[PDB]
């Protein structure tokens, strides 16, 4: 049974032989390298006394996926000061009140707050919502907007499900198949965006009128991942049609950056809501695929395993996600090896560090039993 039921989180690092003291130190150090004043590794920057943001170092912009990740990291680390700085920046510069996507958050902004687009990114919205629910549960709702956390979360999820009903807007989930979309105006998805474990919680905390829907979305996403992951390699494409096959119209039909999160998501869902034969086998497939491959040689791969000459742009992130996936197959043949590889991998430096480091901290929290569900 998952932690949702037992309220006990597996410390896989400890189960694999690492000492409690060294694990505590490593988690704290990872956080400090990302959120502290460590120039070469940091991804979080503070502005004034009430603002802050996470910088996509590779694209030199601020993204909702990153900001929502930051809020989730902050609430897991019990750092309301950082959570509020990020959420404040998000509401001030990213929330849209005009255009067809009013009610959603502009997905990319410049560091000064200027919006680079008026289009949103569903994976950002879903993380904002759960992070907000967790904030409400750990610290209680604030007296002034936008710090009335739980209300903000329910409001956002209302839009995600009902936008378009009486307006030109579009929902972020297809109402018929209950699957999250890549973006509001298209009819295809992105495997890495599927968070059934998040939807399970939304079915308990979202507006009551949508709780049944969220339970159905959780089930739909679990079934979707089964048809999206290659049967032999376990690799999932970045973008995929609702039928599960890759959408490579613009080059996103292979195993690359977005895809890495699938293994991590499967690992967290297993830890929170229980393991499954499919999940264990899926993680075993992915880890088996990388068992004989060196990180320095990781490439972009077709989901069937065929390698491209192009190297992985975020190999550290790949390592982190594969290790986090071990939570779904603790007795897997490569589970220990993956966790050890991750432990032996330093936080990334350089201009492409942002994505790797976000995945790195999530894996550090999950593998140490610190990526928890915060109940009311
Ligand atoms: O085309 C845009 C997408 O690229 C964008 O998706 C983001 C890309 O970076 C990923 O790391 C994020 O997870 C994802 O949100 O969404 C908006 C869309 O217009
Ligand atoms: Ni030490």
Does the Cβ of 119 fall within 6 Å of ligand 1? yes
Instruction: Give the separation between CA 338 and CA 226, rounded to whole angstroms.
Output: 22
Q: What is the C-alpha to C-alpha distance for residues 68 and 90, in angstroms, rounded to an integer?
A: 9
Max distance between CA atoms of the chain, in angstroms, equals 57
Q: Quick one: how far is CA 306 from the chain centroid?
A: 26
Q: Is 121 in the pocket of ligand 1 (CB under 6 A)?
A: yes
Domain membership flag for residue 335: yes
User: Among 64, 101, 107, 256, which residue has the most ligand 1 atoms within 8 Å of its CB, making it the best to mutate?
Assistant: 107
Task: Count the domains in the chain.
Answer: 1
Q: Quick one: which H or E segment has residue 163?
A: none
CATH number of the domain that 113 lies in? 1.50.10.10
Residue 201 lies in a domain: yes
Angstrom distance (rounded) from CA 287 to CA 160: 34
Using the atom order of ligand 1, give the atom closest to the CA of residue 117: 19
Chain centroid to Cα 342, Å, comes to 18
Dihedral sign from CA coordinates of 175, 178, 180, 186? negative
List the domain range (segments joined by +) for residue 177. Answer: 1-369
- Distance between CA atoms of residues 368 and 359, nearest Å: 14
131 vs 201: CA distance, rounded Å: 11
Q: How far apart, in whole angstroms, are the C-alpha atoms of residue 223 and residue 215?
A: 13
* 225 found inside a domain: yes
Decide if 154 contacts 136 (C-beta within 8 A). no
Cβ atoms of 43 and 358 within 8 Å: the answer is yes
Whether 299 maps to a domain, the answer reads yes
| Encoded tokens for 193 | 């965006």
Using an 8 Å Cβ cutoff, are 189 and 242 in contact? yes
The method of structure determination was: X-ray
Resolution in A: 1.5
Ligand nearest to the CA of 258: 1
Q: What number of residues does the chain have?
A: 376
Q: Residues preceding discontinuities in the chain at C–N > 2.5 Å?
A: none
- The alpha carbon of residue 201 and the mean position of all alpha carbons in its chain are separated, in whole angstroms, by 15
Asked, for residue 374, whether it belongs to a domain, the answer is no
The H or E element containing residue 51 is strand 51-54
Question: Which alpha helices (DSSP H) does the chain contain, by range?
Answer: 3-6, 12-15, 20-35, 64-76, 80-89, 122-139, 149-162, 196-205, 211-228, 260-273, 277-290, 315-324, 335-343, 353-367
Look at the block and give the residue holding tokens 């902004």. 109
Residue 271 neighbours by CB distance under 10 Å: 26
- N-terminal to C-terminal alpha carbon distance within the chain: 21
Tokens encoding 88: 């404040």
- Per-residue DSSP letters for 288-339? HHHTT--GGG-EEE-TTSPEEEEEPS-HHHHHHHHHHGGGG-TT-TTHHHHH
Does 376 reside within a domain?
no
Domain assignment present for 227: yes
Q: Answer whether residue 324 is part of any domain.
A: yes
């Amino acid at each position: 049974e998952g932690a949702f039921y037992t309220r006990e989180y597996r410390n896989l690092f400890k189960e694999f032989g690492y000492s409690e003291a060294e694990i505590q130190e490593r988690v704290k150090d990872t956080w400090e390298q990302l959120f502290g004043d460590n120039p070469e590794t940091k991804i979080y920057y503070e502005v004034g006394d009430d603002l802050g943001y996470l910088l996509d170092t590779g694209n030199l912009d601020v993204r909702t996926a990153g900001m929502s990740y930051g809020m989730m990291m902050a609430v897991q680390m019990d750092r309301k000061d950082i959570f509020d700085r990020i959420w404040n920046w998000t509401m001030k510069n990213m929330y849209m009140t005009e255009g067809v996507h009013a009610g959603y958050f502009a997905w990319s902004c410049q560091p000064d707050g200027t919006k680079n687009s008026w289009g949103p990114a569903p994976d950002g919205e879903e993380y904002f919502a759960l992070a907000l629910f967790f904030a409400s549960h750990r610290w209680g709702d604030g007296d002034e907007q936008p710090f009335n956390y739980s209300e903000q979360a329910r409001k956002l999820l209302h839009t995600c499900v009902h936008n378009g009903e009486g307006g030109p807007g579009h929902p972020m989930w297809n109402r018929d198949n209950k699957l999250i979309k890549f973006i509001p105006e298209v009819e295809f998805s992105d495997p890495s965006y599927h968070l059934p474990h998040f939807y399970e919680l939304f079915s308990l905390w979202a507006n009551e009128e949508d709780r049944v829907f969220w339970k159905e979305a959780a089930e739909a996403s679990r079934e979707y991942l089964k048809i999206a992951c290659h049967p032999e390699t376990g690799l999932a494409p970045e973008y995929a049609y609702y039928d599960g096959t890759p959408n490579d119209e613009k080059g996103y039909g292979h195993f690359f950056s977005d895809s890495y999160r699938v293994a991590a998501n499967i690992g967290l869902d297993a830890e929170w809501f229980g393991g499954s034969e499919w999940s264990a086998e899926e993680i075993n497939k992915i880890q088996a695929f990388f068992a004989d491959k060196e990180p320095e040689d990781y490439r972009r791969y077709k989901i069937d395993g065929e390698p491209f000459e192009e190297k992985s742009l975020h190999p550290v992130g790949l390592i982190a996600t594969n290790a986090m996936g071990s939570l779904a197959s603790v007795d897997g043949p490569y589970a220990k090896a993956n966790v050890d590889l991750f432990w032996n991998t330093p936080v990334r430096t350089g201009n492409r560090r942002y994505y790797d480091n976000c995945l790195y901290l999530f894996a550090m929290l999950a593998l140490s039993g610190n990526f928890k569900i915060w109940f009311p």
